[PDB]
């Protein structure tokens, strides 16, 4: 069945599309959802308790430099976190 | 906006069909694919590039998505400048 939370997400995209009147809805979609994805990625990396500050800033800067790698790179963060605890 | 409903509807349909683990990740994925489709379409509806010339820009878009507007300007500056 329909995933819980899809309606809120698509609603946010629609809201920003109406507020900003982008010339390309597809490009604005890629932009919007890439920004949203990196936002939650920063959220995960910044909330993992067992990482330290050099690791935290290293993953955040690493996400800045190479964004597409995010889900690949944040997976590393989880596997670097499960270590210490 | 013209085309919003078809866009959101296609995304939702594919979300049900594929059940991705992350809706945001799948959004980036799906809409990047759509953007490349639109770019291929744009290149493909230029009247005064010719056929073999037309394929070359598509190959440029096949490799990495990050320099599209240059190819739209170059094609737009090549065709409306090539013929009649």
Residue numbers in the entry:
A (entry chain B): 2 to 86
B (entry chain A): 4 to 87
Authors' description from the paper:
Here, we propose a method for generating proteins and protein complexes with complicated shapes using fusions of alpha helices. To design amino acid sequences that can stabilize the alpha helical structure of the fusion sites, we superimposed one or two turns of terminal alpha helices of connecting proteins using a molecular graphics program. Then, the amino acid residues important for forming a fused helical structure were chosen from the two natural sequences in the superimposed region. Our method does not require complicated computer calculations for the design process and can be used for the assembly of artificial protein complexes with predictable and rigid structures.
The third example we chose was a fusion between the protein kinase A regulatory motif (PKA_RIIα) and the protein A module. For the helix design, 6 amino acids of the PKA module were superimposed with the N-terminal helix of protein A. As expected, protein A was connected to the PKA module by a continuous fused helix in the crystal structure. Because the PKA module forms a stable dimer, this method can be used to generate forced homodimeric proteins that may be useful in designing artificial protein nanostructures. (b) Crystal structure of the PKA_RIIα (dimerization domain of the regulatory subunit of protein kinase A)–protein A fusion protein. In comparison, the fusion proteins PKA_RIIα-protein A, MrsD-protein A and DARPin-protein A ligated by the shared helix method have negligible structural flexibility at the fusion sites.
